[PDB]
């Protein structure tokens, strides 16, 4: 890391079609980790290749087995991009054609090109290929959106986008969670855990489905069937699908009504204002499963026994144990509840001590699995151990104030308010909106594609159409996206019969009223259908507080860490800031009484509780530790 | 901290007016009334930005209707240049300069047309209203949405002669996306790597100057420096009044018209006195400074002067070293660091008349930065030319380049001369 | 009793002082003395906190 410099983190002209120029981290790892492009492949020497079609006399031979070429080979040839337009999958149209010759960009007559790229998306990766209207976005926000698409959470009921890009069904077939029928036959048995399909006198095919499993990051891994009993089925047809796919294709977010306008300060600087329908309609709710473990070991004093005869506990805290010391499946556990009861043979009558495992503070849910393993049963265990017990606890989480939401075009935000549905602005038909977004964030960051997406989603909802648009779509016309969106909106207006849907004076804008007073806003605003995602950064996992807890052994300073009641660090930049204020007493109280003055801590606490004055501090322990360490040298 | 009635501001209120009003309120009423005024303004703005219904659309992004003809003319000029190059009339280092200059001038013309179009057709446009008011937008960002992206650079420092001739409204091509990604990655890595340098510099600054605390009231000296405005020759960059606020005078200043005194020895300067000194001439004022104060291993209260956060003389026992280090180090991460266009000036005569140059000025043949040949002039001489109705009174400058020689026919808005506006010759 | 009134009173105390760091110490001393003298089990206006009480008393003494 210390030796890599400016030259290794750059973009070389030889990365074209082999390494994506967009998807990277931000920070210390920017430019040091990359992603393979869509069509690239590695040969047996270890070099990345990419495919091309041959051009003979200005005619593209799309029927002659595209050739794969490495970076050094394609330096003497004149290679054309994948967005050039042909008339009948044949001769190249136009009079001047952009080409690359020896790592430079030039233009030539189209009787002198040699090879043509296969597709317009040959230069980007798979995550960046899922952003519609990408050519109307900046590159930094494209990086943000591609990075944030991989932090979304699978929802309770997934749903396909209306303005997808065409690569969704291929990005889902590699995870191996979608089941397709190889049969072309009939379906004879459907169940929540089993499917069976019978051919035309070709035996039976049976599939078993995984149910509510757990991933590395504590997310569910369900699988559900689509078909009904006695259904005609063709080969290659989807039969069951996973937890993050609708029928065949990826589904990470939801389509909601959006308007672009400021509220009464609740949209300020990337904050998000949502409605209460998203809470009671179970939109944006997810299932998270956790795993807890306890080990029964043996000691020189004696062995350890798992039992419900725990000392110093009453029967009011042993309701849900199964007379063997282990909780029962289907029980609701709140914080500080016993899961498995264990006693250790202490040396001191009763000689056992209680250290049974309990749920950590801030965790609750249902118990769904209590699988347990032991010796004398064919199970391998770590040495010196007698039994292992694993408990699985599940819960359902809803959207709430403090959660992060995102879109495909790089627009992030934190939810700040949840309004009842009579306060939200509403349409000329009475429908309240779902989300209000600030228009100040669009022109200074140059995400113009989100407006295109919103307008096309509005048209698609009104037509029930589900369009698909591929990136770099302007090789066919001068302004293809605008013309397609306008034509779709006009067609929706003619088909529906409602004239307020589309206006010619302000194409993308319609009238909106105030739910609190009933008066219309002065000017029309932009409304549409947006596809938004819920990220893994939830506020239930970011809040922490401490008054007094464990301390370090050597320095006698508070421990650090959320999982062990840790304190917040007061670095030296904050010390400089407090010195610039003229503060002397806040700083001295922070440095001694609240950190490592081993005798002043108890005195301060007792003085506060009793109501007296806090006495003067002494010398902190770290200075004495340093003096001892220097003397030892 | 009262008795000063506000003035009725009968004008539009952008960000500069709000900053001026906040400053006036602090100067006249105190530190607890400014908070109340700011809260009231915040409430009013939040209330009336919602009743307006400000939004953003695709038709709000208005592109001027003359872009196509401008691009056509530029491409015709480029074709002429490349046809001259192919026949051997010009060398390779001149074709690059010509094609770079054409696309550098076309972008300026397009930007002017965009700005003029916004302020005439739709002056309440949402993009125009939110960029002109000083809320969030810029001019280098409005340019790329409705204008033209322009000439970009290699992963090295070189320049690609292929420009981007589309905005984000029309949509880039596959070739232009790569050229943009070059600069995007360069900026990302720059931002990643600047933070460590800035942090190390700030730490070194803090440790060098931590012991500078104010302990004394006065060292009793007579030394100081001379404060003058910061000027780049003809133009001034920082006026003297902005540089003279909070300082303490080491000698009595005098008006240069008579014997009226404006300040005695040892007197701090406020805004009113700074303006009074600036208005009545005077180019240098001698002031005290921490550079020249002879105290015991620190500064004194009189040599330092005002504390800028409070608009008062510094208190006793104030840590000025930490403040100085933090003030120098805070803007460190904001140091984010095309050819001759309007930095020169072409002279075009809007008349049709014969040439009367003769042999008055010193016309030496010269080969300019492009492939053309002209006459280089160093003797400042007033051009004399028969301009149809009346003669010419045009004035050349030293080092100018004149294209028109005698025995020519000048037409309407034909190129006549080039004047450098007010030196490193590299290899 | 409002928070705005306390803010205005504290600003007025800061002025008429000649030193910003010398008034905080006086306020702290007065507050500690008031809280300590409150030890008599009569609860004389215990509702107000000692620092705000010291600020109010010193503002009243300013006339």
């Amino acid at each position: 890391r210390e030796r890599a410099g400016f030259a290794v983190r750059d973009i070389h002209p030889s990365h074209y079609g082999r390494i994506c120029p967009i998807e990277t981290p931000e920070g210390p790892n920017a430019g040091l980790i990359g992603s393979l492009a869509t069509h690239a492949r590695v040969n047996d020497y270890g070099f990345i290749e990419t495919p091309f079609w041959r051009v003979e006399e200005g005619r593209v031979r799309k029927d002659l087995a595209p050739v794969y070429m490495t970076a050094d080979q394609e330096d003497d040839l004149r290679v054309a991009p994948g967005d050039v337009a042909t008339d009948d999958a044949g001769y190249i149209l136009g009079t001047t054609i952009p080409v690359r010759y020896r790592q430079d960009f030039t233009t030539t007559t189209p009787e002198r090109v040699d090879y043509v790229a296969l597709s317009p998306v040959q230069i980007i990766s798979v995550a960046t290929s899922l952003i519609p209207f990408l050519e109307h976005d900046d590159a930094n926000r494209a990086l943000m959106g591609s990075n944030m698409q991989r932090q979304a959470v699978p929802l309770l009921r997934p749903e396909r986008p209306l303005v997808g890009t065409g690569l969704e069904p291929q990005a889902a077939r590699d995870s191996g969670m979608v089941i397709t029928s190889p049969v072309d036959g009939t379906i004879s048995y459907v169940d929540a855990t089993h499917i069976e399909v019978t051919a035309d006198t070709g035996e039976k095919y049976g599939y078993a489905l995984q149910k509510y499993q757990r991933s590395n990051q504590d997310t569910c891994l369900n699988q559900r069937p689509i078909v009904f009993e006695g259904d005609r089925v063709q080969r290659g047809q989807v039969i069951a699908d996973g937890s993050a796919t609708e029928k065949g294709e990826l589904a990470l977010g939801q389509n909601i009504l959006v308007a672009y306008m400021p509220w009464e300060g609740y949209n300020y600087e990337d904050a998000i204002l949502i409605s209460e329908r998203l809470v009671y309609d179970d939109v944006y709710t997810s299932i998270h499963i956790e795993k807890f473990e306890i080990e029964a070991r043996q000691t020189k004093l004696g062995p350890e026994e798992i039992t419900r005869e725990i000392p110093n506990v009453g029967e009011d805290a042993l309701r849900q144990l199964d007379e063997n010391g282990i909780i029962r499946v289907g029980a609701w556990v709140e914080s500080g509840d016993i899961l498995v009861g264990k006693v250790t043979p202490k040396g001191e009558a009763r000689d056992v001590r209680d250290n049974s495992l309990r749920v950590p503070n801030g965790e609750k849910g249902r118990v769904v699995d209590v699988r347990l393993f032991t010796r004398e049963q064919g199970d391998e265990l770590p040495p010196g151990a007698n039994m292992v017990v694993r408990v699985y606890v599940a819960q359902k989480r809803k959207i709430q104030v403090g959660d992060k939401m995102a879109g495909r075009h790089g627009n992030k935000g934190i939810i700040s308010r949840i309004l009842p549905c009579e306060d939200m602005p509403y349409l000329p038909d009475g429908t309240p909106l779902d989300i209000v977004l600030n228009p100040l964030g669009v022109p200074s960051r140059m995400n113009v594609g989100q407006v295109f997406e919103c307008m096309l989603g509005w048209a698609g909802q009104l037509l029930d159409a589900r369009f698909k648009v591929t990136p770099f779509d302007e090789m066919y016309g001068a302004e293809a996206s605008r013309l397609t969106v306008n034509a779709k909106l006009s067609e929706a207006r003619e088909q529906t019969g409602q004239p307020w849907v589309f206006s010619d004076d302000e194409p993308g804008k319609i009238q909106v009223y105030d739910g609190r007073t009933g008066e219309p806003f002065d000017r029309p605003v932009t409304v549409g259908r947006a596809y938004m995602l819920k990220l893994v950064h939830l506020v239930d996992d970011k809040i922490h507080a401490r008054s007094t807890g464990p301390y370090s052994l050597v320095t006698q300073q508070p421990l650090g860490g959320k999982a062990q009641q840790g304190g917040q660090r007061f670095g030296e930049m904050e010390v400089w800031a407090l010195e610039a204020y003229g503060a002397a007493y806040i700083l001295q109280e922070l440095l001694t009484v609240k950190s490592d003055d081993m005798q002043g801590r108890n005195e301060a606490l007792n003085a506060i509780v009793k109501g007296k004055a806090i006495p003067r501090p002494g010398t902190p322990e770290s200075f004495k530790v340093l003096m001892r360490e220097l003397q030892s040298l | 901290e009262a008795k000063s009635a506000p003035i009725f501001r009968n004008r539009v209120i952008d960000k500069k007016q709000l900053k001026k009003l906040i400053g006036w309120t602090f100067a006249h009423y105190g530190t607890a009334k400014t908070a109340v005024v700011a809260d009231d303004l915040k409430a009013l703005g939040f209330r009336y930005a919602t009743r307006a219904g400000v939004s953003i659309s695709i038709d709000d992004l208005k592109v001027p209707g003359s872009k196509a003809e401008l691009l056509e003319s530029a491409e015709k000029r480029i074709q002429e240049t490349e046809d001259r190059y192919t026949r051997g009339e010009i060398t390779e280092v001149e074709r690059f300069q010509k094609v770079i200059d054409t696309w550098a001038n076309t972008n300026d013309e397009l930007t002017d047309r965009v700005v003029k179009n916004f302020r005439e057709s739709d002056p309440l446009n949402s993009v125009y209203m939110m960029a002109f008011s000083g809320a969030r937008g810029n001019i280098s960002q409005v340019r790329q949405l409705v204008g033209m992206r322009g000439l970009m650079a290699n992963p090295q420092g070189e320049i690609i002669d292929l420009p981007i001739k589309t905005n984000f409204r029309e949509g880039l091509t596959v070739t232009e996306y790569i050229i943009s990604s070059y600069g995007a990655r360069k900026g990302l890595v720059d931002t990643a790597l600047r933070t460590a340098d800035s942090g190390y510099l700030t730490r070194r600054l803090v440790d060098v100057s931590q012991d500078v605390i104010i302990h004394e009231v006065d060292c009793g000296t007579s030394r100081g420096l001379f404060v003058e405005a910061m000027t780049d020759g003809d133009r001034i960059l920082i006026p003297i009044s902005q540089r003279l606020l909070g300082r303490v005078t080491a000698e009595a200043v005098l008006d240069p018209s008579t014997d009226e005194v404006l300040a005695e020895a040892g007197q701090d300067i406020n805004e009113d006195l700074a303006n009074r000194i600036e208005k009545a001439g005077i180019k240098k004022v001698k002031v005290r400074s921490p550079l020249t104060c002879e105290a015991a291993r620190s500064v004194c209260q009189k040599c330092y002067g005002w504390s800028l956060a409070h608009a008062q003389m510094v208190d006793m026992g104030e840590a000025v070293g930490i403040i100085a280090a933090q003030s120098i180090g805070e803007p460190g991460t904001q140091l984010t660091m095309v050819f001759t266009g309007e930095t020169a000036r072409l002279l075009r005569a809007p008349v049709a008349g014969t040439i009367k140059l003769g042999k008055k000025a010193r016309t030496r043949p010269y080969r300019t930065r492009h492939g053309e040949e002209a006459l280089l002039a160093e003797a400042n001489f007033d051009l004399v030319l028969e301009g149809k109705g009346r003669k010419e009174t045009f004035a050349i400058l030293q080092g100018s380049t004149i294209f028109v020689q005698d025995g020519d026919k000048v037409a309407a808005e034909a190129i006549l001369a080039e004047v450098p506006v007010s030196r490193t010759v590299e290899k | 009793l409002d928070s705005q009134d306390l803010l205005f009173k504290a600003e007025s105390l800061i002025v008429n002082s000649t030193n910003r760091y010398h008034v905080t110490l006086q306020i702290a001393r007065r507050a500690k003395q008031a809280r300590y003298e409150e030890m008599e089990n009569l609860s004389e206006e215990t509702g107000i906190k000692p620092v705000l009480r010291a600020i109010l008393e010193m503002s009243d003494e300013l006339n």
Binding site: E579, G582, A583, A584, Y585, Q588, G618, F623 | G317 | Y21
Partner: peptide, 16 residues
């Protein structure tokens, strides 16, 4: 150096 030991700094309210 007073920060390391844990004393009142000689600047501000700890001046005297």
């Amino acid at each position: 150096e007073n920060v390391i030991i844990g004393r009142l700094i000689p600047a501000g309210t700890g001046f005297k």
